[PDB]
Write a protein that binds this ligand. Structure first.
Ligand SMILES: CCCCNS(=O)(=O)c1ccccc1
Ligand SMILES: CCCCNS(=O)(=O)c1ccccc1
Length: 122
């Protein structure tokens, strides 16, 4: 089964808390991504890697697309799952370059670009 909205929010907030402290950036900077604010800020980039590593969606220098699909299946509203799979289907085929922080940040931006209105990142 899938997790309820409030359980998704709780886990996201706790992952954020952990990574914000570790990476030493502000909540404002993380919240900016949902507003389409993607500065070339290496610390924000590394925050994205911290979160994806927690979710097991990035590991050993590469995306784990099987786990990205599993995570979206367990956390998205059911009426959004197919649309989410279609976003992953597009973004998985873009080349990601640079260090791990740069790669995950680029992937997150690809997700945003496919649907800015509904974008969410912990
Ligand atoms: C908003 C609904 C989609 C959430 N998906 S998530 O991968 O960001 C995620 C968030 C929180 C816990 C686990 C995964
Ligand atoms: C798409 C939701 C499942 C994957 N979760 S994620 O945190 O890696 C993530 C990557 C990119 C955008 C949002 C969340």
């Amino acid at each position: 089964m899938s997790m309820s909205a409030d359980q998704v929010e709780k886990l996201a907030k706790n992952m954020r808390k952990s990574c914000l402290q570790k990476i030493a950036i502000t909540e404002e900077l993380v919240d900016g991504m949902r507003r389409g604010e993607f500065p070339d800020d290496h610390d924000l980039q590394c925050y994205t890697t911290c979160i994806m590593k927690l979710l097991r969606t990035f590991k050993n220098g590469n995306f784990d697309f099987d786990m990205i699909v599993k995570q979206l299946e367990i956390t998205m509203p059911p009426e959004e799952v197919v649309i989410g799979k279609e976003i992953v289907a597009v973004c998985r085929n873009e080349e990601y370059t640079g260090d791990d922080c740069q790669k995950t940040y680029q992937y997150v931006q690809c997700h945003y670009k496919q649907n800015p209105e509904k974008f969410f990142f912990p």
